Structures are given as C-alpha cells and as structure tokens.
Point group: D2
Chain length 360, copies 4
C-alpha cells in the first residue's frame, strides 16, 4: 500500500530549510521518503528569477548531507519544482510530498508520481518535441503513482525551461530558429506546450488536434488539471502527477475544480467541496490549495477592462498571481497557498485549474 | 430646496477619457452644472510619479468648462476632482460622478444619500504630516458635513480626501528656505499626508479626542484611526479636497450609503457587512450596487493572519500597489465586478493592515 | 526665405508650459511660427505612458489660447512628438522648432531647415507592416519638400512619432476579423518603430524597396536608416514626421550634423556627431542647442562581447535601460544630461546602435 | 614580510556561475588556498529583495569548500565574500578574485598593490546606521590596514565593505523587543547601513575627526565623507566585511591601485584621473586595467549640474538602480568595457551625488 504525507512549510527566505529540518529532526519526515518539493519562492517569477535555483540548491545541499549522497543524486531522486513570484499577500512556503510503503487498511486516497523528461535544445521549446516528450513523461508519472484512470488525476504540476537572450543567440549561431525571440514570451510557449503534453497524455485532447501552430494560439485546447511553471534553472521538464487511487492508505485526498476567471471564488469553493471540505468549519483540514492564474487575452474580466496586458512596469503573470492568491486567501482565510501564473492551455483563457489537498 | 444626489459609476478607456460622462450629459441624465465631485481610479502607478491623476482632472475640467461656458479655473474651484491612481490586478479604471440636484420635491422617508464638499487652504511642504494639516482637514470636514446637511457624525459613512505629497524638488526647496519636512523621502511623504488627513477626519467626527493627537503620534500610534476616512495623495494638488458621503433626513436621493471596516486585506466578511449596511442582503440584490469604495494597505507587521508576505520588502513594486491589487481582487470576488474603488495606504484609516469600506446602493 | 530657431526648454512636469510661455511673453518666440515640439516626458516611455499625451494636451491648450484658435487646429498645424522615458540622469525638456519667413538673403552654404508632415491614421492591424512603411515614406518626402531639402544627403535626422497596440485595440482588430502583427503591446512598439524607420530609409534611398517586406520588418537588421529616430505612443493613431537637415535656401544661424553610434557606449560617435555639426573642441560645446539620439539593447545580449541583462530583465523593460545608458554616455561627453535620447532603435542604425544628431549654433 | 597580490576579473553567466574561477584553478593560475576575497557584481536588483547576492556567496563557498577539503563554514570565516547586487544598463556580471600569498622577494621599486581583510561582529538591527556600527567598522578597517601592511592612510585607495540591512520582519522583531531602529523603512535602512559604514572608514583613516560624527550626522551631514569608502548592503549578512585595497612598500605585486573621486554621476574626468593615478596615461595603456571600482548615487538635490532628473521621484525604479546604470555607462564609455564594478548608494562616500572610483592596473 502507498501512503502519501504532505507538509506545507512556511519559509523565511528562498534558502530557508529550517522548517523542513525541524520535521526531519523530530522524526515526522524520513528524508529518504521525500519524492517531491513544490515551492513558492519570493523572486519575481519571470525570466530573471534566481530564487528558484537558490531554493533548489539549498534544499539539495541540505538533503544530500542528511542522506549521505551527492547533490546530483538528490536532484535525480526528488522533484524540485520552484514556482517564483509571491506577489500581493502570497506567503512563501514549500510543500513536501512524502511517500511511504505500509501494508495496512478504503476508497481512493492521495497518490503521487514523478517523472523527468530529457533536456531540450532551445529550438525545441514550445513545439511538438516538448509536447510529445512531456506526454510520455506524464504517463510515466501516472504509473509511478499507480493511477490507471486518467479521471483520477486531479493535478499535474510541471517545471519547464525558458529562453534567455544567451540561449537564443547561441541557437542563432548554430543556425536554428527558436519558437519566439522574446525571453518572457518563451515562458508562455514552454508552459503551454508542456500543458498540452499533459492534455495529450491524459486523453483530454486527441493528438490530431495538436500542432506547432496551435501552441499558444487555440485556447479551446486546454487541460483541466495541468499546472506548468517555467524557470531558467533547468533544461528539461519535471513532472508531478497527483491524484487518488484505490491502492492507497493515505489519510489525505485531493479534489479540484477550474476557475472560470481570476475572481471565480465559486470554483475555489467547488474545489474545497470536491476534496471533502463542505463548510467553513472544515477549513482547517486544508493541507494546501494549488491553482493556476493568468491574465485573459481579451484584456477584461467579466466585461471590465484591466491593465495587466498594457502595464509595461509589472508583467502580467505577477499581477495574475496576486489576484488569484487574494481570491483564494479570502475564501480559506490563509494566503499561504500555491498560485502559479501563466495558464496557457490550463483551464480556459483567463482561468486555471485549482486543486485542494485536505485531511480526511 | 431639497437635495437629491445621483451617483454614476462610469468605465474609462484611459485617464483622459471623458466619453462616458459626455454620453450621460448628452442624453440629459446629468446636468453638468449640478456635478459636485468626481472620484476617479486612474491607471498610473498611484505613487509619486503618477501623472494620470492630473491628466484626468485636466481633461475633465477642460470638458466641463467648455460644456458650461466657464473657465477651467472656475470648474476646479467648484467641483472636487479626486483622482486615485493605481489600477493594479484586475481593478478597472473608472470615475464616480456625484451629482447634486436642488429639487422642489419632498424628502424621502428616512435617511438617504447626501454629499458635501470642502477644500482646505494650500499647505506649505513643511506642514504635511503635521498638526497644521490635521487641524485644517478637521475644519474642512465639518464644513463639508454642513454642506451635506448631515449634523450627526454617525450618519457619515465615507470621507474621501485628496491630499498633497513631497517631491524631491519641494523637499530641496524647503531645505533652501531653512525648513525641515516631516520626512526626507517622496514615497513616505504620501503616508504622512494620508495619515494626518485621516486623523483630521477622526478629529472632526469625534472618533478620537484632540488630546490624543500630536505630531509624534502621526504615522506612529495605529490605535488612533477613523472608521470612515479614505485618503489619497498626489503631486497634482497643494491642498486637501474633501468629499463627505453619508445619509440625511433632508435628502430625496434614491440611494443610501453603508460601510464597515476591513480588519485586514483578506476580510471578505467586512465586504459583506458593508453591503448589508447599505441594504444589500443577498447576492441577488447586488445589482443595486452603485460602487464599492475601500482602503487597502500592507500591515506594518509584514504579515497577514500570521503569514509572511513581501509587500514591505519588495524593492521592485511599492506596497500600496500590491495592497490595491489584493483588496480589489477580494472585493471583486464577493461582488462579481472588479470595477470598484480601491485606494492604497490606510494610515489611521481602519486598523493597521485594514481600512474602511463603503457601499453606495440603490434603495 | 526660411529661418529656423530652436529652443531647448527644461520642464518641471509633463504639463509644464511655463518655460515656453516665458519665451513667448519675452518676445523671443512668436507662437504662430512654431512648427514642431519634440519632448522628453517623464513617464515610463513604454505602453502605459500617459505623460506623452498629457504634455501634448497641455501644449495644445496653451498655444490654442495664445493664438485664439481651437486645440484641434493647433494639432493639425504643429507636430507634437513626445518621447517618454527620462531614466537615469536624463532631464525632461522640450525642444521647440520655430520657422520664420525672412527677406534676408541665403547664408553662404547650408543652414538648418525643418519640415513637417503627417500620415493618415492607421488601423491596428496595419502597424508593423508595409502599409505603415509606405505611408511613412510618402510623408517623409512631403516633409523634405516642406523643408526645402532636395538632396537626401542633407537630411541629418528624421524624428517620428508612431502608434502602438493596446489589448483593447487588439480586441477591436479581432472583432473586425483582423490579425495584428504581434499580440504583445510592448513588442508592438518595436514593430511600429521599425516599420516607420524603414519608411524613412525607403524615402531617403538608404534601402531599395525590393529588399523590404513584412517578413523583414524587425528581423533583417542589415536594413536600416542612418538618420531615422522613431518613437511610439498610445496618444496618437498616425505617424508624425519632422525632417531636420540643412538647405541652401535657409537663413538659419544653426546647422545640424550627425553620426551613428555603433553601440550603446560609442562615445566616439558622439564626438563625431559634434564635429559634423561644427563643434571641433570641448570649448565649443557651448554652441550645442540639443543632441538627439537613438539607443537600444542589442539582440545579441552583449556589448563588445560583454553580457548584460537588458533583454532578460523582467522588472525593467529594455528600452528604459538603453535610454539611461546612452543619455549617460552623451551627458559625459557634452557635460549636460538635458539631451534627447529615445529607446528602441529597430532599423535605426545597426543592431544595438542608433543615429545621433547635433543641432549647433554656427 | 613580502606579500604578492594577484587579481582576476572573471565574467559570470549567472549568480551561481563558478566556471571561470574553476578554469583558473584547474590550470594552476590560482591556488584556491590563497584566495582572500571575492568582490562580485550579481544580477539581482541590488536592493532589499536581492537573493542573487546570497546565491552567489553560497555557490562560491560550496565550490571552494570542496576544492579545499574544508567546510563551507570555515571558507566563510576565511574568505571575504562581498556580493554587490544590481547589474543595470550594460553593466556586465562578474567577480573579482583577490589572491594573496607571502613570497620570498626583494624590495619592489616603489609601492605595489596590497590587500587586507577584516570582519566585524554581527550587529543588532537597532545598531545599524548608528555609532555602534561606525565605531566597530572603524576598528575593523584599522585591522584590515594592518593585514594589508599599510600604515599610512594616504596609501589606502579603496575600502570595500558589505554591510547589513533591515527587513520588515527584523523591524517587527526589534519592535517586539522594545527597540527602535534608525528608520522604519527597509530600503532606506540600506542607506543608513552604507553611510554609517562609510563614516567608519573615514574615522579609521583620519579623513574625519571623531568629534564631528554622531547619530544625528549620519545620512544628514553630507560635508562628512570618505574619499575611498565603497559600501554595499545585503540581506545575506548581519555583520560588516571589509576589504582594504592600497599600495605598500612590502608588496611584490605586479599591480598597483589608484583612485579619484567622481564629483557627480557624469564626471568622466574623474574616471581618467583614476586611470592616470593607476599609471594608465593614454588610451593605448588601457589594456592594463584589471578592474575599475566605483560608487554611484542620486544627489539629494534631485539634479545633476543644475538639471533635474527623476531618480528620487520614480516610484517604479529605485534610485540606486538608476545611479548604477548611469555611472557604469560613463565608465564603460571611457574604458571601452562595461564589465566594471559599480555600486549604488554613496552616503558619506565622496560628495553628495558623487563617489570614489579606483582602478587596479598592471604595472
Ligand atoms: Ca488558462
Ligand atoms: Ca489602516
Ligand atoms: Ca539600431
Ligand atoms: Ca556620495
């Protein structure tokens, strides 16, 4: 039997491992059983965010020394997905996923799987090469989680690469053309291609509907559970599949809904209910809320104009994260929840998936 | 005669967009001679170097001057123009136009919306954030209450103020004249102007006694605050402009105002309390909203309900910008509409980390 | 006979008309003879910069009341080109171009001449495409005639204001069944600037028409003008053109010269521009009326092989950084940060560089 | 006691890039045991929430610990790590590595490059920007002068310091402990830490007499400044780290250091004067530059040579970011290379609006 435990840990800085160390030193976490850490780090969440790599380096160092292995082996063994940007009231934190085998005694309970893709050349980001390799890795992660029914996947969290000026120019020197000649926009193509990879692997969209031309163009194509995030600190995709399976002894469950837009508090309440939280009094059973946020391509929300796509000072994914975190925070009474910005092919245009991990 | 207040919340396409107001004037719904105040959300950064505020006022004053056949200077002496910059997150730029009609009709039964306007003298740079600004604002708030025909401060539900700030040029001029300003920082000067102005509201309304207010308490003693003050700072003016909004027995308005106080930036309960205080008791009655007006800020503790955030540590985005995005998103999620008024920096306006929130609603 | 006088006026804010009013009230400027005003306004110089429109509105309202005509007529008569972004030490200011008819003879040789022309408004789906290139080229030739300049070699600076795309305008284009050149408001500024600059190069013979296509715009950096200076704004829907050069039929006591900065730190090009304008030593720097230059981040992400972060910085857009850098370089050569520097130099000088002109007293 | 200093300016591809240093170590050009200090330009925002500084130090400490077979803790006690954030404009990220070893050499002709290092104790938040930091820094500067074998302060040409700052959480902790900090503003706290640290340099070197320094003068009396101090603040440390750079008769280095003082942000003449003071007398000798190190800042007057700028009014971009872009561009245009060290915020470092500038050059 598979047992998943999940710990939401406040952090004081990107390199703060003290909260995790406390759980390890007390015996609550066996570090050998950590399979994934999903972080909100307090950089800008865009191209030049180095808090993501700083956080991964610090955690890999700490765990490597606790486990007596190399940092390189830790990163091959544990998924480190650091989502930058803690705008508004969003509280920096890490979510640690622990998976234990115990033979013990109902229904379906939380299950997790992890998979990594190969490194991508710069000219492969945002194109079918990334779509198809991610799709394979998602199936790989589903099996690792022992989930056979794609309907039982409630959240697929991915970290994916981006283009820097340096990588674009290197591609230029090698005679290769990149999907887009813009560092910030490259994040959208990488996020969206990865998300279409989830939809492809999960059967949400048929392969004949996906092409290079549809990536970041056909917003009718999206996954209802995909959550993708981009960073300078890696060259491949890291996959975490989270769902429920009948062969689990976890005392946790995951549910989800889809925010129709950035202010869709109803979808937050629907996600809570799908995870078994039916009243405000049961709010303390939340382990974490995980959601995608984005600026709608129309430049409006419910017929009302906003400046997210016109604001040259603050990039739109920063604003979307602040908004959606505030909406969730106002429903659950806690701003320490995971919100990642840029939801290309993840929920509808201007919306995004939202999942809740809760105590049973 | 009898006062009837009508309020129009008008979407804008840019700071200088007067088209929505012009449509209401051209259709006969607004007599421009009866406009008494315009409260705007303009899409600049809402901080020191926000010129969308002055651009919006200039555009409105030009337009109204030409419609009325008077000079822009006379319009500005007659009509309050309070432009609150910063439309972060999903917050929708718009203006709220306050029209006051004299009508030979009976007052409505009970108390209905009433509005009053008053302007203070200009302040010297060295007076911002100090008792001179507190006491002059308090005097003007009482004048605006009289203008609104509100004698009981308990019937005042929102006092909206525009106040000045310090630029580097004004600080340096003060230094040459041998004067010390309250703070040698342009962005922080907004907080002192906002806070002194808010304490002036609290003093005028009896929310705080005069003996508790001193220069040393301004922007320091957060136990002192008004539950209805809403203050906003700008480079585009040198005085304080005051709009008092409340209810009066001597009003024929088909509108009312209610309010509550957000205890913190994510206090959706306070939004629902303000709606209820304005007579909106269910989600179906939210179509009676004319506007929601709220103050937002980063708490001095650097936390919300024990959870850290970076608003006070973020050197890229100033904290009033972040607070506005948050509180607008919270309100928008309750009412289903991000076109509501949210202003940042709530010194002495509600508790530390919170702020007053009012609702103007149709009866 | 034409005489051009040029006044560089410090401003205290985008709406500050006091310095211009002082020159009018002192008798130094007849407002009826103003033909163009080129401003540096202290907004962010990107998409959501409303200081540009605030400055034009304030200047048009002031001049309309001084002249006893409508604001609409002022805007039809006078070019208002407000370049946002005053980063670093760059000092906000306006440069006012006055053109007088004089009976004096022709000054021996060539002296400053200015011409102005406007294009029609463009639909959003036209920005960054050949329609903008070709309409700009037509207007540049008209402005050359207005300036009485027949030889393109005597054109030393072609300053343009051009439109941009906002989310709402993109949505309008979509609603009308049209696709825009790019679905990014900030990037739309580059396409508008670049198409406009290629229009200058076409009109002046710097590039042949058969080399220009929609695909080349903002892609083939071998195609550029050595005198074009283009600037984009939400506050207008057309292109406004100011051609500045020298003409034999000018009685101006000023001349214009120029060079091309090869990169953002090319102080040699600043000195070369000064020398081309007759300023041969540091002591003659007092003859400067203004220096006008284009600045940009190179697509390579480097300057002389050294990496910089301008194209990777998600907090500060690259045209803001380039303006701060090039203004500082010029300021250090001429001893004055109140010079005109505009960012985003697509097809204006080489990739990573831009034209630089000097207006100087003879 | 003859000492030889070698200095290596190394381009970096990211804050954590150690590859250039590893190349010099692997080729035998640098014995890692002889590294005494690393001075970095890291590509974060250079303000409060810049974590590239700590990322760079952590990466360098890890790498050196593994190369030397010691713990990271010992590396940090052994090697000064001063990471100056902010690579605005064309400023190129890089590190400058200082190697120092004893050598059996004869007396050099004249004086040659010398370096000394010293660390202060950790400071309480309430000690930053006050005499406790001034006096402790002065003590450490004198210690570093001894480490460098420089007895005459006129032979000190650059004193580079990393110092702490205040975050919201540290301010709130101080408040909970009943303590008042020098300023209740995270960004402004950097200026007080930088300025107090610079005054400590001036005190140690005899540039200013002790009786002129008090808490009230810190960040207020701009007549008081050091001509060689260069201070930089960061969240990643709680003490001050000091690198003294000068020339000594007891040096066998093939390098020298010279300096001047930029009177304002566009003072290219001072750049050429610093080059000349380092023995570089013509453009043809420019290839002898190892690095140029300079301080930059926005003048409190809000102007440069009487011309207004917006650095102190700009609520979007903090003034130290703008000053760094400007001064780096000025230097780059003189020397033809933007990979030079420029640090922003020059409180008590050169005049108001200016700052020291040093050149390390091959003989
Ligand atoms: Ca989506
Ligand atoms: Ca408050
Ligand atoms: Ca160019
Ligand atoms: Ca200084």
């Amino acid at each position: 039997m598979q047992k998943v435990e999940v710990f939401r840990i406040p952090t004081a800085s990107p390199d703060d491992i003290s909260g995790l160390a406390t759980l390890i030193d007390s015996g609550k976490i066996n570090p050998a059983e950590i399979v994934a850490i999903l972080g909100k780090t307090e950089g800008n969440g865009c191209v030049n965010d180095f808090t993501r790599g700083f956080a991964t380096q610090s955690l890999a160092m700490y765990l490597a020394e606790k486990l007596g292995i190399s940092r390189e082996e830790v990163v091959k063994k544990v998924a480190f997905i650091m989502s930058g940007g803690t705008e508004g009231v969003m509280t920096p934190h890490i979510t640690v996923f622990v998976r234990k085998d115990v033979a013990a005694p109902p229904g379906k309970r939380l299950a997790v799987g992890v998979a990594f893709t190969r490194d991508f050349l710069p000219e492969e980001l945002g194109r079918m090469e990334q779509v198809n390799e991610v799709a394979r890795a998602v199936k790989e992660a589903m099996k690792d989680a022992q989930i056979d029914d794609p309907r039982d996947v409630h959240f697929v969290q991915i970290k994916c690469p981006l283009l820097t000026a340096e990588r674009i120019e290197d591609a230029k020197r090698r005679g290769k053309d990149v999907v887009v000649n813009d560092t910030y926009k490259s994040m959208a193509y990488s996020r969206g291609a990865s998300a279409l990879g989830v939809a492809l692997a999960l059967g949400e969209i048929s392969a004949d509907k996906i092409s290079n031309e549809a990536i970041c163009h056909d917003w009718n194509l999206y996954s209802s559970v995909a959550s993708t995030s981009a960073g300078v600190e890696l060259l491949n995709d890291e996959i975490i599949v989270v769902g429920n399976s009948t062969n689990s002894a976890s005392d946790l469950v995951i549910g989800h809904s889809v925010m129709k837009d950035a202010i869709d508090a109803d979808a937050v309440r629907a996600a809570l209910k799908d995870a078994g939280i039916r009243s405000d009094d049961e709010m303390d059973r939340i382990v974490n809320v995980l959601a995608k946020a984005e600026a709608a391509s129309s430049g409006t929300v419910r017929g009302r104009r906003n400046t997210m796509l016109d604001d040259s000072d603050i990039n739109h994914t920063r604003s979307a994260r602040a908004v959606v975190n505030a909406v969730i925070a106002s429903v659950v009474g806690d701003p320490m929840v995971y919100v990642s910005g840029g939801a290309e092919h993840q929920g509808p245009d201007g919306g995004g998936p939202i999942a809740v991990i809760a105590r049973v």
